[PDB]
Amino acid sequence: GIRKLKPTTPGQRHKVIGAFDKITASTPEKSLVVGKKKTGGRNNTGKMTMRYIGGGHKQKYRFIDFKRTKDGIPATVKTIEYDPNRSSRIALLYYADGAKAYIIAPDGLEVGHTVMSGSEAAPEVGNALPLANIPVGTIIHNIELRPGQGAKMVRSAGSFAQLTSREGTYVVIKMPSGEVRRILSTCKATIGSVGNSDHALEKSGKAGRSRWLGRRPHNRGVVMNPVDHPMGGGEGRQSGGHPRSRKGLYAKGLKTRAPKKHSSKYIIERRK
Amino acid sequence: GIIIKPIISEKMTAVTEKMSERYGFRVSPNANKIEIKKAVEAMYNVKVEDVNTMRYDGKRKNRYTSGLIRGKEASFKKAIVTLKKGETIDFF
Amino acid sequence: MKRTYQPSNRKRLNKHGFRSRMATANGRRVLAARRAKGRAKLTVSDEF
RNA sequence: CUACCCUUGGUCAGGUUGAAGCUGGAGGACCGAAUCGGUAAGCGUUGAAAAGCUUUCGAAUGAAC
RNA sequence: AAAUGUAGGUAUAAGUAACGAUAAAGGGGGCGAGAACCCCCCUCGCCGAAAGACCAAGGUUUCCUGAUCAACGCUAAUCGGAUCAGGGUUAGUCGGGGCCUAAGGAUAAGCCGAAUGGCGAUUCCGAUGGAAGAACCGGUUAAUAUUCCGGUACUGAUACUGCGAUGUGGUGACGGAGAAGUGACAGUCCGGCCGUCUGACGGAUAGGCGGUUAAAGGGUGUAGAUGUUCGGGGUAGGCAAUCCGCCCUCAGAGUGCAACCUGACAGUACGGGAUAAAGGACGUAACCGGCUCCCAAGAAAACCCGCUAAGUGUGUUACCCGUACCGUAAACCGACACAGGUGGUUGGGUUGAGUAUACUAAGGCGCUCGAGAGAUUCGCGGUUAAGGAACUAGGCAAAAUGGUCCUGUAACUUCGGGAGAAAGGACGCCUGUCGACAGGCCGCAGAAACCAGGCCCAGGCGACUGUUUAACAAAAACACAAGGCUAUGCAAAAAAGCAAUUUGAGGUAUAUAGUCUGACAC
RNA sequence: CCUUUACUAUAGCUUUACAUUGUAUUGGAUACUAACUCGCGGGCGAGGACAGUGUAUGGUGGGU
Ligand SMILES: [K+]
Numbered sequence A: 001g002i003r004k005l006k007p008t009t010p011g012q013r014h015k016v017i018g019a020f021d022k023i024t025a026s027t028p029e030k031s032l033v034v035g036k037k038k039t040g041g042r043n044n045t046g047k048m049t050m051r052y053i054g055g056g057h058k059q060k061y062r063f064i065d066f067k068r069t070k071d072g073i074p075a076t077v078k079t080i081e082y083d084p085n086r087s088s089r090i091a092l093l094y095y096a097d098g099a100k101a102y103i104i105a106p107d108g109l110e111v112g113h114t115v116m117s118g119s120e121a122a123p124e125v126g127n128a129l130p131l132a133n134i135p136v137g138t139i140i141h142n143i144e145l146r147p148g149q150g151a152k153m154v155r156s157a158g159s160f161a162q163l164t165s166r167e168g169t170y171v172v173i174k175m176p177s178g179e180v181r182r183i184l185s186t187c188k189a190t191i192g193s194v195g196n197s198d199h200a201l202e203k204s205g206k207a208g209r210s211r212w213l214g215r216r217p218h219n220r221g222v223v224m225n226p227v228d229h230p231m232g233g234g235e236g237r238q239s240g241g242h243p244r245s246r247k248g249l250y251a252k253g254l255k256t257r258a259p260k261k262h263s264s265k266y267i268i269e270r271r272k
Numbered sequence B: 001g002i003i004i005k006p007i008i009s010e011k012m013t014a015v016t017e018k019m020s021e022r023y024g025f026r027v028s029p030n031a032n033k034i035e036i037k038k039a040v041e042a043m044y045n046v047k048v049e050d051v052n053t054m055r056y057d058g059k060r061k062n063r064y065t066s067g068l069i070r071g072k073e074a075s076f077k078k079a080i081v082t083l084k085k086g087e088t089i090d091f092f
Numbered sequence C: 001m002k003r004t005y006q007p008s009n010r011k012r013l014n015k016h017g018f019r020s021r022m023a024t025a026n027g028r029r030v031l032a033a034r035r036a037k038g039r040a041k042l043t044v045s046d047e048f
Numbered sequence D: 001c002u003a004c005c006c007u008u009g010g011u012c013a014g015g016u017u018g019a020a021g022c023u024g025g026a027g028g029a030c031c032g033a034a035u036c037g038g039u040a041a042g043c044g045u046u047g048a049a050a051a052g053c054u055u056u057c058g059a060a061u062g063a064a065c
Numbered sequence E: 001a002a003a004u005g006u007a008g009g010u011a012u013a014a015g016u017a018a019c020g021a022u023a024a025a026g027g028g029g030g031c032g033a034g035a036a037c038c039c040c041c042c043u044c045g046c047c048g049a050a051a052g053a054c055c056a057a058g059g060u061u062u063c064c065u066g067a068u069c070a071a072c073g074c075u076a077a078u079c080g081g082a083u084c085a086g087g088g089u090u091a092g093u094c095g096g097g098g099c100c101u102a103a104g105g106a107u108a109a110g111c112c113g114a115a116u117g118g119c120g121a122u123u124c125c126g127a128u129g130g131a132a133g134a135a136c137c138g139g140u141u142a143a144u145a146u147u148c149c150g151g152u153a154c155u156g157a158u159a160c161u162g163c164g165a166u167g168u169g170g171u172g173a174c175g176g177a178g179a180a181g182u183g184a185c186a187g188u189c190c191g192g193c194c195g196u197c198u199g200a201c202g203g204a205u206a207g208g209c210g211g212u213u214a215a216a217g218g219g220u221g222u223a224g225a226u227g228u229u230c231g232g233g234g235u236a237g238g239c240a241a242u243c244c245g246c247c248c249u250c251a252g253a254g255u256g257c258a259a260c261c262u263g264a265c266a267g268u269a270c271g272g273g274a275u276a277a278a279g280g281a282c283g284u285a286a287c288c289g290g291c292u293c294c295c296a297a298g299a300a301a302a303c304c305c306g307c308u309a310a311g312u313g314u315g316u317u318a319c320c321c322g323u324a325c326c327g328u329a330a331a332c333c334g335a336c337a338c339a340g341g342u343g344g345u346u347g348g349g350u351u352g353a354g355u356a357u358a359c360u361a362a363g364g365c366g367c368u369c370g371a372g373a374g375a376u377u378c379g380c381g382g383u384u385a386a387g388g389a390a391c392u393a394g395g396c397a398a399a400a401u402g403g404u405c406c407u408g409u410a411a412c413u414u415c416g417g418g419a420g421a422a423a424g425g426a427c428g429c430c431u432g433u434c435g436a437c438a439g440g441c442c443g444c445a446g447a448a449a450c451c452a453g454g455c456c457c458a459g460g461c462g463a464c465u466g467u468u469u470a471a472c473a474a475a476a477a478c479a480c481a482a483g484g485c486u487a488u489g490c491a492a493a494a495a496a497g498c499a500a501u502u503u504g505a506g507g508u509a510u511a512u513a514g515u516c517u518g519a520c521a522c
Numbered sequence F: 001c002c003u004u005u006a007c008u009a010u011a012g013c014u015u016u017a018c019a020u021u022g023u024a025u026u027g028g029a030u031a032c033u034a035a036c037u038c039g040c041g042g043g044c045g046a047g048g049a050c051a052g053u054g055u056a057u058g059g060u061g062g063g064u
């Protein structure tokens, strides 16, 4: 699912890119795209609040349907497309009544399949059902946190979650990070994993590819002056002391979850 | 007070000597072509066929005293009027 | 070599013109100080 | 002015090599004008210039101008 | 009488430095009190992908003409971008603006906040972009010219000879790279026609010189290109999402080529005439918003077309602003008539791979101090016996190499490289034969000038291309692709803010943030 | 101007008390919903007297 380049140039020696073999169409749908403006990490006051953001290719935004509200109406998969806004691929659906939508492409979903959403839908790859109607032990993605809100969790390329147990008004789900938490049974999920699992095997190869992706170079704290960073200064190379940020936040184990967040009632086992 | 004065210059005398229906006036800088055709026709009682216009800012006249006392002449508009073929105008 | 003043009439009025001075309290404070001094040139909108 | 960013435009003679898929024509690939710089030497130091000139040199389809 | 004290004036150094790129001048006439410099003519020299031509920004009368030479002009000046006066810029189509929206800005309802105020729409403003309203060639002035005149076009309104938006659809509507085939203009050559001349010295009534022109618009559908392919949306509709009967891309797009064309330029002759002054061969993307490949996946709204809801002919006419002149500069940014900087278009001929290089046309210039003389010394250049790095901190600088084609290329290697490794040979002209072959000719030298790699062996550091101390440091410093650790379950952590709110991100652990290490091998 | 285990403060973070803040069973827990908080669509969900905020207070605090 990847393509390794031959070492003709020093910039191409270690470069690995995707094969783009699941893609079936070259251009997006007209009614589902809009031009997207870039922030350089600046907020509405114009100050740069996030560093290392800037440049890159112009991109159009694609409208992804994370709610899957057209319940009971069948849909058919027409094309599988490239999407610059996310690490996974996307699939174009034509509903039987005339609506069109984009969804995250599950692994194993191909052109010509039929998909559905609702409580009375078959548990098949690409189908959206409430957790109450999803069998135990299934592989699922696009997990709602609240009913009616829309998919928020388990959406990146190659990601999946397993539904482990039922607890009445709550289910138990194991997340990609290893955490185990309770989710409401009226929420919705899509069967299968997220596709493009070989996305983590890519190697950019050269500094230039980072700039195409919109990233700017990142400076170490030990090579600055004390006025800019607590880790700076010194005659020759120094270690800089305890690793910390520009505001002095310890970078080697300080926990930052608020210790009185209410959602801790639902987190059964933790890994993050 | 649209028309300020006619133009009697070397260039305009030659233009009239070729096109007998062609004359030129000085007019208020903020008058439009439709108004100017009305004024030349309501005062000389002719058939105006075409009007061309140009706007001149005044010439700066900077004198010196204790220096740079700026001066300027008033801006004006030039109208070149073409009459109906066969009609003339007499400035005397 | 390239020097500090590269004129642009559109930029000049946007940054210093009469309508930009009147848009804020501190700009109108500047206009009041220049009037009280008796300046002949009030803003860059006058020299034009 | 300068540093970075946002939107919208423009520019890059000629030659060479020959990746993926005899053909094909990739590349922060090569040589080299415009152009962007500023390596070394000489000159200038009440200078033509409050940072330049001449020769030489680097990049020149890109993290380009 | 003194504070490196302040203002104004005047000294000294001194008739000294200097008069701003070493592209260059000489002669004859002229006006004039006055001429190295001004005007005219002959010769010479410089630029010519510019030092020529057309715009934008910026400037704002510097543009043309008459008068003037006090000041300005690094000299003088009869001259000037100087002083004074007069004159000069002409648009239904060009460029703007009127229409539309981007970044951003101002707001409405709301939110926040000692005050001043900060935020906040699908609203409005705002081009550097999009417009379904449309013109090109020539000629005339001392100074304007798609604007005036000529010719030939086009686009709105207007007068006389069932409609369908404020809602909601369609369109508009978009990247990079690559080459090919077809084939204009320009340009070159050959060859006719028209006019004109007979050029210091030997030769030529056969030659020299100038011409022989063209756009928009209209036509054709040619080269060439593309097309043989019953559920998903816009038209028959109700406030875009559970239907049914109905007309198709089988033709689109398109150079070249007709016509526009009995215009025009130069030169002779006298507004008119020669003058209705043949044709070829190459060359040739201006077909092309096309074709092919790739990943980094390539604005918005309006104009223009739908839908329902609610309800041809003629004539007249086309408003506003810009339009001079400079613009790789003496007119803009640099205090200067300053060797610097300044976006876009065009840019002939021979040579060439070329927009490099050399020489030239059109056009523009000889750079606002000269004349003598030819010491020392300095700046920029040229040559040099014998030696050849002995110089010096150091081969610094200079010399040397350098082109095309044909041979031939090592260690090592991440298998790509190293590599143009290194080292060699041929190169002009004439004759013939099938770029080559052979014979011959000339010279010291055939890559002929200009142009145009020096190479090799071995170490330290950094993997690499990049970035940096504007103005003494370009590096072994920074960044980097990549590796680890830690935080973060989504009103995420983190950042900004008094807050509201925004970034993160409209991303969701193959993700985001902090931090250290820095390709790769072990 | 810079540094820190110099001194004294302080933004921020964090602890408890009072207010916001109620009701049952058995103080301290369990339970409830009506304060209060978030989501959907134009009432239904999910939480809940916690959380957040004001005042007071201990700790931390070269970030300043
Ligand atoms: K770094």
Ligand SMILES: [K+]
Residues within 6 Å of the ligand: A226, A227, A229, A230
């Ligand atoms: K600090």
Ligand SMILES: [K+]
Residues within 6 Å of the ligand: none
């Ligand atoms: K620099």
Ligand SMILES: [K+]
Residues within 6 Å of the ligand: none
């Ligand atoms: K004169």
Ligand SMILES: [K+]
Residues within 6 Å of the ligand: E275
């Ligand atoms: K003719």
Ligand SMILES: [Mg+2]
Residues within 6 Å of the ligand: A223, A224, A225
């Ligand atoms: Mg440092």
Ligand SMILES: [Mg+2]
Residues within 6 Å of the ligand: A235, A236, A237
């Ligand atoms: Mg040390």
Ligand SMILES: [Mg+2]
Residues within 6 Å of the ligand: B050
């Ligand atoms: Mg007219």
Ligand SMILES: [Mg+2]
Residues within 6 Å of the ligand: B053, B054
């Ligand atoms: Mg006008």
Ligand SMILES: [Mg+2]
Residues within 6 Å of the ligand: none
């Ligand atoms: Mg390169």
Ligand SMILES: [Mg+2]
Residues within 6 Å of the ligand: none
């Ligand atoms: Mg160069």
Ligand SMILES: [Mg+2]
Residues within 6 Å of the ligand: none
């Ligand atoms: Mg190189």
Ligand SMILES: [Mg+2]
Residues within 6 Å of the ligand: D032, D060
């Ligand atoms: Mg190069």
Ligand SMILES: [Mg+2]
Residues within 6 Å of the ligand: E004
């Ligand atoms: Mg002194």
Ligand SMILES: [Mg+2]
Residues within 6 Å of the ligand: E016
């Ligand atoms: Mg002396």
Ligand SMILES: [Mg+2]
Residues within 6 Å of the ligand: none
């Ligand atoms: Mg002397």
Ligand SMILES: [Mg+2]
Residues within 6 Å of the ligand: E018
């Ligand atoms: Mg001097």
